[PDB]
Amino acid sequence: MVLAALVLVLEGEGLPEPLGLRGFFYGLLREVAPEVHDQGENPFALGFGGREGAAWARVSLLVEGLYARLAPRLYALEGEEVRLGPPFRVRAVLQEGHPWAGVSTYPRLFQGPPSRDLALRFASPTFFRRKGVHYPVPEPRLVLESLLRRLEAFGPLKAPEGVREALLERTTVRSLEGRTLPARTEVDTAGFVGRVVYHLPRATEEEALWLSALGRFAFYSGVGAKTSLGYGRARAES
Amino acid sequence: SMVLAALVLVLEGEGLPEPLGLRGFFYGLLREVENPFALGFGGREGAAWARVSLLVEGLYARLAPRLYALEGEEVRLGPPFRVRAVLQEGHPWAGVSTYPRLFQGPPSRDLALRFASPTFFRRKGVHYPVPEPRLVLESLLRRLEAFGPLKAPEGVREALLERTTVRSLEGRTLPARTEVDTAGFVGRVVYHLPRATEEEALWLSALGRFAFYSGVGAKTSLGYGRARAE
RNA sequence: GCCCCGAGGGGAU
Numbered sequence: 001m002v003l004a005a006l007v008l009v010l011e012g013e014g015l016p017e018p019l020g021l022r023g024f025f026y027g028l029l030r031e032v033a034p035e036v037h038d039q040g041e042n043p044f045a046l047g048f049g050g051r052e053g054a055a056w057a058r059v060s061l062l063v064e065g066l067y068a069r070l071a072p073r074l075y076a077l078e079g080e081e082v083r084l085g086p087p088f089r090v091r092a093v094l095q096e097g098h099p100w101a102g103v104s105t106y107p108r109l110f111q112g113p114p115s116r117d118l119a120l121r122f123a124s125p126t127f128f129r130r131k132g133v134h135y136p137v138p139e140p141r142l143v144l145e146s147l148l149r150r151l152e153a154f155g156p157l158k159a160p161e162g163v164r165e166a167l168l169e170r171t172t173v174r175s176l177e178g179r180t181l182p183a184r185t186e187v188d189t190a191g192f193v194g195r196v197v198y199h200l201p202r203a204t205e206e207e208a209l210w211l212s213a214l215g216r217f218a219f220y221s222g223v224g225a226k227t228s229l230g231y232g233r234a235r236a237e238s
Numbered sequence: 239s240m241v242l243a244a245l246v247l248v249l250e251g252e253g254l255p256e257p258l259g260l261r262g263f264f265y266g267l268l269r270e271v272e273n274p275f276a277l278g279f280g281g282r283e284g285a286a287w288a289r290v291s292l293l294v295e296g297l298y299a300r301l302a303p304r305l306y307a308l309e310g311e312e313v314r315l316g317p318p319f320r321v322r323a324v325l326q327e328g329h330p331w332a333g334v335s336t337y338p339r340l341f342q343g344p345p346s347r348d349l350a351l352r353f354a355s356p357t358f359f360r361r362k363g364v365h366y367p368v369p370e371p372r373l374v375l376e377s378l379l380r381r382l383e384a385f386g387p388l389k390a391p392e393g394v395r396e397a398l399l400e401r402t403t404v405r406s407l408e409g410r411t412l413p414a415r416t417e418v419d420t421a422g423f424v425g426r427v428v429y430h431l432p433r434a435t436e437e438e439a440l441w442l443s444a445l446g447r448f449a450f451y452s453g454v455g456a457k458t459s460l461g462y463g464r465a466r467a468e
Numbered sequence: 469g470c471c472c473c474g475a476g477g478g479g480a481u
Contacts, residue, residue: 023481030480040478085481129476132469133432135403137370145475168475172361173368175421177410187469190406201364225477432469 125191256316356422
């Protein structure tokens, strides 16, 4: 039931590098969860951010077994030097007291209040796979299919079809503000950063509930492709 | 034949043209003498302009004489203005061409469009403000095929609509003040068609050139969807 | 762009 996003507060210069962060993360699992590398839907997501001198990394876990297996290892890293591309000292491992740290449960994603609208902030470059070509436009179905798919893959609930068809086929965009930035790990790829407000016309109370739930879930799962490299870090706003 | 024109009316007077006033003014001109035209307006307050895009020869032959006859006259486009000049060139949004010249090339797999007024599309009964490749390019292609002498082979259409991705996007949605509950995109988008054949690339570049005249998306008759290739 | 999976996803510093 638990969802967790733990933030590593880092000491050192520069920021974590996507590939190094992912390598560091997968290094912790090759012991205790060798299987997650090959699975087609990741039960985790990585991120990083901050200004120079105030860098941080983040590990989001969408399944309980992983939290159990990994959280003890992460806490044991406090005060130690790790490599996330460049070397850093893990000052603290935070569940609370950081904007991108948090814990919840899957049922709690569904405690509303419901809303016809969903304002998503994309905080790192976000893009999607179509036909083996990356696409940076945060269209409603891409975003919400991305969220819904994983919510279901790892949560205890799936949506009634009415709700789903509403979410994916009927959700529109009310406003969009932002720009694309290069995804440095990829070839000829950029990703959207900014704010998009989605709206579901004729939304039932239920539909609105689920929309809000996908919104809340995004904080943990991220959106789109290559969340294992820190892309698609997003959260709901008002 | 196959003339294409975008004539700019540079204005003397305070304020800016209003969409409804401008379209009404144009509608008048239509009696007296897809839409085979588009309208636009812009500039700073006090240095405003309006523009009339004519996509078919008949309408040019019929309307150009009326617009030129307004030089130095007062017109109402919401606020009152004196028409300083009617320009087919010498202004960034004025121009004349022909449909064949739209295919002059060079062909290119990239197309950078600037959306200079709010741009949106009619979708399932609602207005949608996101400049998706399929929407932008379908809009342009539909109009180009409506008024031009050529039609894209089906495979080309398919490539353009389904394969074109976005290399970069920068901008924001702004309210469409004439509308209810509608916003439109303003900014810059660079479209890219991977592995475009020569023909596909040629068509992409031609749609790009046609945009200057037709505009993109819904309600171009109110000045929305004003755009150009960069 | 390449491999794998199957609207889109995964890819061990």
